[PDB]
Short mmCIF file of all heavy atoms in Angstrom, two decimals:
data_model
loop_
_atom_site.label_atom_id
_atom_site.label_comp_id
_atom_site.label_asym_id
_atom_site.label_seq_id
_atom_site.Cartn_x
_atom_site.Cartn_y
_atom_site.Cartn_z
N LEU A 487 3.56 -3.54 -14.99
CA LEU A 487 3.67 -2.39 -14.07
C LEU A 487 4.64 -2.69 -13.02
O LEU A 487 5.21 -3.80 -12.87
CB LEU A 487 2.34 -2.06 -13.56
CG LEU A 487 1.16 -1.79 -14.52
CD1 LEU A 487 -0.11 -1.39 -13.80
CD2 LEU A 487 1.59 -0.71 -15.45
N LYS A 488 4.90 -1.62 -12.17
CA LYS A 488 5.76 -1.74 -11.05
C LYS A 488 5.20 -1.30 -9.72
O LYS A 488 5.72 -1.60 -8.66
CB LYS A 488 7.07 -0.87 -11.24
CG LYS A 488 8.29 -1.68 -11.64
CD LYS A 488 9.50 -0.76 -11.88
CE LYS A 488 10.70 -1.51 -12.28
NZ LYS A 488 11.87 -0.61 -12.46
N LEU A 489 4.05 -0.54 -9.73
CA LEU A 489 3.49 0.01 -8.53
C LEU A 489 2.03 0.45 -8.84
O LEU A 489 1.84 1.22 -9.82
CB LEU A 489 4.36 1.13 -8.00
CG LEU A 489 4.07 1.69 -6.59
CD1 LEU A 489 5.34 2.11 -5.96
CD2 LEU A 489 3.08 2.84 -6.69
N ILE A 490 1.08 0.06 -8.03
CA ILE A 490 -0.28 0.48 -8.24
C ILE A 490 -0.81 1.04 -6.88
O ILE A 490 -0.75 0.33 -5.84
CB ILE A 490 -1.20 -0.72 -8.65
CG1 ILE A 490 -0.71 -1.23 -10.06
CG2 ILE A 490 -2.65 -0.33 -8.77
CD1 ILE A 490 -1.35 -2.52 -10.48
N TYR A 491 -1.37 2.25 -6.95
CA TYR A 491 -1.95 2.86 -5.79
C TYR A 491 -3.35 3.28 -6.15
O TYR A 491 -3.51 4.10 -7.14
CB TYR A 491 -1.13 4.03 -5.32
CG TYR A 491 -1.62 4.68 -4.04
CD1 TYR A 491 -1.24 4.21 -2.76
CD2 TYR A 491 -2.52 5.72 -4.09
CE1 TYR A 491 -1.67 4.79 -1.62
CE2 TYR A 491 -2.99 6.34 -2.90
CZ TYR A 491 -2.57 5.87 -1.71
OH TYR A 491 -2.98 6.43 -0.57
N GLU A 492 -4.38 2.90 -5.37
CA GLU A 492 -5.76 3.20 -5.66
C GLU A 492 -6.41 3.67 -4.35
O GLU A 492 -6.02 3.27 -3.30
CB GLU A 492 -6.51 2.01 -6.21
CG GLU A 492 -5.89 1.45 -7.48
CD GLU A 492 -6.93 0.69 -8.28
OE1 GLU A 492 -8.04 0.45 -7.84
OE2 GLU A 492 -6.54 0.26 -9.45
N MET A 493 -7.35 4.52 -4.49
CA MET A 493 -8.11 5.16 -3.41
C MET A 493 -9.62 5.07 -3.65
O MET A 493 -10.30 6.09 -3.62
CB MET A 493 -7.59 6.58 -3.22
CG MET A 493 -8.24 7.38 -2.04
SD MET A 493 -7.36 8.88 -1.66
CE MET A 493 -8.37 10.15 -2.29
N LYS A 494 -10.10 3.86 -3.94
CA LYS A 494 -11.50 3.70 -4.19
C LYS A 494 -12.41 3.98 -3.02
O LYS A 494 -11.86 4.38 -1.98
CB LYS A 494 -11.74 2.19 -4.65
CG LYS A 494 -10.78 1.73 -5.73
CD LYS A 494 -10.82 2.65 -6.96
CE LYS A 494 -12.15 2.56 -7.66
NZ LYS A 494 -12.59 1.17 -7.85
N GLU A 495 -13.73 3.82 -3.18
CA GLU A 495 -14.64 4.34 -2.13
C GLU A 495 -14.46 3.59 -0.83
O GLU A 495 -14.45 4.23 0.23
CB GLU A 495 -16.06 4.17 -2.65
CG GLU A 495 -17.10 4.43 -1.56
CD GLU A 495 -18.56 4.32 -2.07
OE1 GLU A 495 -18.76 3.61 -3.08
OE2 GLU A 495 -19.45 4.88 -1.42
N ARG A 496 -14.32 2.30 -0.87
CA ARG A 496 -14.41 1.44 0.34
C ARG A 496 -13.06 0.79 0.72
O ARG A 496 -13.07 -0.18 1.51
CB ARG A 496 -15.49 0.42 0.22
CG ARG A 496 -15.33 -0.46 -1.03
CD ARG A 496 -16.50 -1.43 -1.25
NE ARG A 496 -17.78 -0.74 -1.56
CZ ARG A 496 -18.89 -0.91 -0.94
NH1 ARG A 496 -18.97 -1.65 0.17
NH2 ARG A 496 -19.95 -0.17 -1.35
N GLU A 497 -11.95 1.26 0.05
CA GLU A 497 -10.64 0.65 0.46
C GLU A 497 -9.50 1.51 -0.13
O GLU A 497 -9.79 2.42 -0.95
CB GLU A 497 -10.53 -0.78 -0.06
CG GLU A 497 -10.89 -0.91 -1.53
CD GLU A 497 -11.10 -2.33 -1.95
OE1 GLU A 497 -11.29 -3.16 -1.05
OE2 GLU A 497 -11.00 -2.58 -3.20
N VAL A 498 -8.32 1.24 0.26
CA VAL A 498 -7.15 1.87 -0.30
C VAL A 498 -6.10 0.75 -0.48
O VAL A 498 -5.42 0.32 0.48
CB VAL A 498 -6.57 2.97 0.66
CG1 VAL A 498 -5.23 3.48 0.08
CG2 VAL A 498 -7.54 4.10 0.80
N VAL A 499 -6.02 0.23 -1.70
CA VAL A 499 -5.17 -0.90 -1.99
C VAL A 499 -3.74 -0.41 -2.41
O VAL A 499 -3.62 0.80 -2.77
CB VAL A 499 -5.76 -1.77 -3.11
CG1 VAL A 499 -7.18 -2.11 -2.75
CG2 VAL A 499 -5.63 -1.10 -4.44
N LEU A 500 -2.76 -1.29 -2.42
CA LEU A 500 -1.41 -0.94 -2.82
C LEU A 500 -0.67 -2.22 -3.22
O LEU A 500 -0.72 -3.22 -2.46
CB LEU A 500 -0.67 -0.24 -1.69
CG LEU A 500 0.75 0.21 -1.99
CD1 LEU A 500 1.05 1.49 -1.36
CD2 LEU A 500 1.77 -0.82 -1.46
N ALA A 501 -0.12 -2.22 -4.38
CA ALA A 501 0.76 -3.29 -4.92
C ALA A 501 2.13 -2.81 -5.08
O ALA A 501 2.39 -1.58 -5.23
CB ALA A 501 0.21 -3.91 -6.21
N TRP A 502 3.06 -3.77 -5.11
CA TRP A 502 4.48 -3.39 -5.23
C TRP A 502 5.27 -4.56 -5.76
O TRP A 502 5.04 -5.71 -5.26
CB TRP A 502 5.08 -2.88 -3.96
CG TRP A 502 6.26 -2.03 -4.07
CD1 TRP A 502 7.04 -1.88 -5.13
CD2 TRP A 502 6.80 -1.14 -3.06
NE1 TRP A 502 8.07 -0.99 -4.89
CE2 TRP A 502 7.97 -0.53 -3.59
CE3 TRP A 502 6.49 -0.87 -1.71
CZ2 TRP A 502 8.70 0.35 -2.85
CZ3 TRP A 502 7.26 0.00 -1.00
CH2 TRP A 502 8.37 0.63 -1.56
N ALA A 503 6.17 -4.36 -6.68
CA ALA A 503 7.01 -5.45 -7.27
C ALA A 503 8.47 -4.95 -7.30
O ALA A 503 8.87 -4.42 -8.31
CB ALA A 503 6.46 -5.91 -8.60
N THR A 504 9.20 -5.18 -6.21
CA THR A 504 10.59 -4.83 -6.17
C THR A 504 11.37 -6.03 -6.77
O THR A 504 10.81 -6.99 -7.16
CB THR A 504 10.98 -4.49 -4.74
OG1 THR A 504 10.02 -3.64 -4.13
CG2 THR A 504 12.34 -3.83 -4.62
N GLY A 505 12.69 -5.87 -6.81
CA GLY A 505 13.50 -6.93 -7.33
C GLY A 505 13.78 -8.07 -6.37
O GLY A 505 14.50 -8.98 -6.70
N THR A 506 13.25 -8.00 -5.17
CA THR A 506 13.48 -9.00 -4.15
C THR A 506 12.24 -9.40 -3.39
O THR A 506 12.40 -10.30 -2.45
CB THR A 506 14.58 -8.59 -3.22
OG1 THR A 506 14.90 -9.71 -2.33
CG2 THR A 506 14.23 -7.42 -2.39
N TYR A 507 11.11 -8.87 -3.62
CA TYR A 507 9.85 -9.30 -2.99
C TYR A 507 8.68 -8.79 -3.79
O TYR A 507 8.83 -8.28 -4.88
CB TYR A 507 9.83 -8.79 -1.52
CG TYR A 507 9.77 -7.28 -1.36
CD1 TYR A 507 8.58 -6.56 -1.41
CD2 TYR A 507 10.94 -6.57 -1.06
CE1 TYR A 507 8.56 -5.21 -1.24
CE2 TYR A 507 10.92 -5.22 -0.89
CZ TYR A 507 9.74 -4.53 -0.98
OH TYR A 507 9.68 -3.16 -0.85
N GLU A 508 7.46 -9.02 -3.21
CA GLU A 508 6.22 -8.66 -3.92
C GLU A 508 5.11 -8.55 -2.91
O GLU A 508 4.75 -9.57 -2.28
CB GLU A 508 5.94 -9.71 -4.96
CG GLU A 508 4.77 -9.40 -5.91
CD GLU A 508 4.57 -10.39 -6.98
OE1 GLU A 508 5.37 -11.33 -7.07
OE2 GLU A 508 3.58 -10.27 -7.75
N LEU A 509 4.55 -7.40 -2.74
CA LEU A 509 3.53 -7.06 -1.66
C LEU A 509 2.24 -6.68 -2.31
O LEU A 509 2.16 -6.03 -3.31
CB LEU A 509 4.11 -5.98 -0.76
CG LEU A 509 3.35 -5.61 0.52
CD1 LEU A 509 3.41 -6.70 1.52
CD2 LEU A 509 3.89 -4.30 1.12
N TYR A 510 1.18 -7.02 -1.57
CA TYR A 510 -0.21 -6.67 -1.93
C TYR A 510 -0.99 -6.34 -0.66
O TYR A 510 -1.54 -7.30 0.02
CB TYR A 510 -0.90 -7.81 -2.67
CG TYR A 510 -0.21 -8.17 -3.98
CD1 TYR A 510 0.72 -9.18 -4.04
CD2 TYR A 510 -0.53 -7.56 -5.18
CE1 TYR A 510 1.35 -9.51 -5.20
CE2 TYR A 510 0.06 -7.93 -6.36
CZ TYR A 510 0.99 -8.90 -6.38
OH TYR A 510 1.63 -9.25 -7.55
N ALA A 511 -1.05 -5.09 -0.29
CA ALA A 511 -1.59 -4.65 1.00
C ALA A 511 -3.01 -4.03 0.70
O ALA A 511 -3.29 -3.52 -0.36
CB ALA A 511 -0.73 -3.71 1.74
N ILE A 512 -3.84 -4.08 1.76
CA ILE A 512 -5.18 -3.44 1.68
C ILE A 512 -5.40 -2.66 3.01
O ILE A 512 -5.34 -3.24 4.08
CB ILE A 512 -6.27 -4.44 1.50
CG1 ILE A 512 -6.31 -4.91 0.04
CG2 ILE A 512 -7.63 -3.86 1.85
CD1 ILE A 512 -7.41 -5.85 -0.31
N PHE A 513 -5.63 -1.40 2.88
CA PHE A 513 -5.81 -0.46 4.04
C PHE A 513 -7.20 0.04 4.10
O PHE A 513 -8.12 -0.30 3.34
CB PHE A 513 -4.82 0.67 3.94
CG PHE A 513 -3.39 0.27 3.90
CD1 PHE A 513 -2.73 0.01 2.72
CD2 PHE A 513 -2.66 0.14 5.05
CE1 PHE A 513 -1.47 -0.38 2.65
CE2 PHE A 513 -1.32 -0.23 5.07
CZ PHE A 513 -0.72 -0.50 3.82
N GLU A 514 -7.48 0.93 5.11
CA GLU A 514 -8.76 1.46 5.38
C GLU A 514 -9.03 2.67 4.36
O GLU A 514 -8.11 3.28 3.94
CB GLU A 514 -8.87 1.96 6.77
CG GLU A 514 -9.18 0.92 7.81
CD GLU A 514 -10.68 0.66 7.98
OE1 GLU A 514 -11.41 1.66 7.92
OE2 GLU A 514 -11.09 -0.53 8.09
N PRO A 515 -10.33 2.89 4.10
CA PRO A 515 -10.59 3.87 2.99
C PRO A 515 -10.32 5.34 3.34
O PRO A 515 -10.29 6.15 2.40
CB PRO A 515 -12.07 3.68 2.73
CG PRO A 515 -12.61 3.09 4.02
CD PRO A 515 -11.54 2.24 4.58
N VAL A 516 -10.09 5.69 4.57
CA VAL A 516 -9.97 7.08 4.97
C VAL A 516 -8.57 7.34 5.55
O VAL A 516 -8.39 8.16 6.43
CB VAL A 516 -11.06 7.50 5.97
CG1 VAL A 516 -11.20 9.00 6.08
CG2 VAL A 516 -12.40 6.91 5.57
N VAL A 517 -7.58 6.64 4.98
CA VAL A 517 -6.13 6.87 5.34
C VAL A 517 -5.50 7.80 4.38
O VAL A 517 -5.79 7.72 3.15
CB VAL A 517 -5.47 5.51 5.44
CG1 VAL A 517 -4.07 5.64 6.09
CG2 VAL A 517 -6.33 4.51 6.19
N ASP A 518 -4.54 8.57 4.87
CA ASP A 518 -3.76 9.41 3.98
C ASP A 518 -2.62 8.55 3.43
O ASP A 518 -2.60 7.30 3.54
CB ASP A 518 -3.23 10.60 4.75
CG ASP A 518 -2.58 10.27 6.03
OD1 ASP A 518 -2.64 9.06 6.42
OD2 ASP A 518 -1.95 11.15 6.65
N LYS A 519 -1.64 9.16 2.78
CA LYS A 519 -0.59 8.39 2.07
C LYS A 519 0.70 8.20 2.88
O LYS A 519 1.27 7.12 2.83
CB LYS A 519 -0.28 9.08 0.70
CG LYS A 519 0.52 8.25 -0.21
CD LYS A 519 0.09 8.57 -1.62
CE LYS A 519 0.59 9.84 -2.16
NZ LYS A 519 0.98 9.70 -3.62
N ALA A 520 1.17 9.22 3.61
CA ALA A 520 2.42 9.11 4.34
C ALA A 520 2.23 8.05 5.44
O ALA A 520 3.18 7.27 5.72
CB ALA A 520 2.78 10.45 4.99
N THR A 521 1.08 7.96 6.09
CA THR A 521 0.84 6.90 7.04
C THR A 521 0.89 5.51 6.39
O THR A 521 1.47 4.60 6.95
CB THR A 521 -0.52 7.11 7.73
OG1 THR A 521 -0.49 8.36 8.44
CG2 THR A 521 -0.81 6.01 8.69
N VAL A 522 0.27 5.39 5.19
CA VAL A 522 0.37 4.12 4.44
C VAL A 522 1.76 3.70 4.21
O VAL A 522 2.15 2.52 4.44
CB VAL A 522 -0.46 4.19 3.20
CG1 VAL A 522 -0.13 3.04 2.29
CG2 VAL A 522 -1.96 4.18 3.48
N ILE A 523 2.56 4.66 3.72
CA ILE A 523 3.97 4.32 3.44
C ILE A 523 4.77 3.91 4.64
O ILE A 523 5.62 2.99 4.65
CB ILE A 523 4.63 5.42 2.66
CG1 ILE A 523 3.92 5.59 1.28
CG2 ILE A 523 6.09 5.23 2.44
CD1 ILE A 523 4.35 6.81 0.50
N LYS A 524 4.56 4.66 5.75
CA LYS A 524 5.26 4.37 7.02
C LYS A 524 4.87 3.00 7.47
O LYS A 524 5.71 2.22 7.89
CB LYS A 524 4.87 5.42 8.02
CG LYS A 524 5.97 5.54 9.16
CD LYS A 524 5.65 6.81 10.00
CE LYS A 524 4.19 6.75 10.49
NZ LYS A 524 3.94 5.88 11.62
N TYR A 525 3.58 2.60 7.45
CA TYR A 525 3.13 1.28 7.85
C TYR A 525 3.72 0.25 7.00
O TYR A 525 4.14 -0.84 7.53
CB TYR A 525 1.59 1.23 7.82
CG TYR A 525 0.94 1.88 9.10
CD1 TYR A 525 -0.38 2.21 9.07
CD2 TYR A 525 1.68 2.17 10.24
CE1 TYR A 525 -1.00 2.79 10.13
CE2 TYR A 525 1.09 2.79 11.29
CZ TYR A 525 -0.24 3.10 11.25
OH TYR A 525 -0.84 3.70 12.35
N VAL A 526 3.72 0.45 5.71
CA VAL A 526 4.30 -0.59 4.83
C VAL A 526 5.78 -0.82 5.12
O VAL A 526 6.30 -1.92 5.15
CB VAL A 526 4.05 -0.15 3.35
CG1 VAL A 526 4.94 -0.96 2.42
CG2 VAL A 526 2.60 -0.33 2.98
N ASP A 527 6.54 0.29 5.28
CA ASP A 527 7.95 0.15 5.51
C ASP A 527 8.21 -0.55 6.87
O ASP A 527 9.04 -1.43 6.94
CB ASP A 527 8.62 1.53 5.56
CG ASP A 527 10.16 1.40 5.69
OD1 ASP A 527 10.72 0.33 5.41
OD2 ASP A 527 10.77 2.43 6.06
N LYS A 528 7.44 -0.26 7.89
CA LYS A 528 7.57 -0.94 9.23
C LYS A 528 7.26 -2.39 9.06
O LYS A 528 8.04 -3.25 9.58
CB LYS A 528 6.72 -0.24 10.25
CG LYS A 528 6.80 -0.89 11.64
CD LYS A 528 6.08 -0.06 12.64
CE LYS A 528 4.54 -0.15 12.43
NZ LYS A 528 3.82 0.55 13.54
N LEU A 529 6.18 -2.74 8.35
CA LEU A 529 5.86 -4.13 8.15
C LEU A 529 6.93 -4.86 7.40
O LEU A 529 7.25 -6.04 7.74
CB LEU A 529 4.52 -4.25 7.43
CG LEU A 529 4.19 -5.57 6.75
CD1 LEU A 529 3.84 -6.62 7.81
CD2 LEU A 529 3.08 -5.41 5.82
N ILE A 530 7.46 -4.25 6.33
CA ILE A 530 8.52 -4.96 5.56
C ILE A 530 9.77 -5.16 6.42
O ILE A 530 10.39 -6.23 6.34
CB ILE A 530 8.85 -4.16 4.27
CG1 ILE A 530 7.68 -4.15 3.35
CG2 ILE A 530 10.05 -4.70 3.63
CD1 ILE A 530 7.45 -5.47 2.70
N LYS A 531 10.15 -4.22 7.25
CA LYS A 531 11.28 -4.40 8.16
C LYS A 531 11.06 -5.57 9.12
O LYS A 531 11.92 -6.42 9.31
CB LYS A 531 11.55 -3.13 8.93
CG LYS A 531 11.91 -1.91 8.07
CD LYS A 531 13.40 -2.00 7.63
CE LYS A 531 14.00 -0.61 7.71
NZ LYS A 531 13.52 0.34 6.71
#
C-alpha cells in the first residue's frame, strides 16, 4: 500500500510511505480530516 486512513471508534490513525520518508501518526477520535492533514504537513515541515 501507499496510504492508510482509518476512523475507528477510539482513534484516527494515518500511515504514509512517500519516496523520502515514512510516517505513522495517531490522532484523537473526534477530529475531522482537513485539520489532520494540516497538522501532519506542519509537523513534517
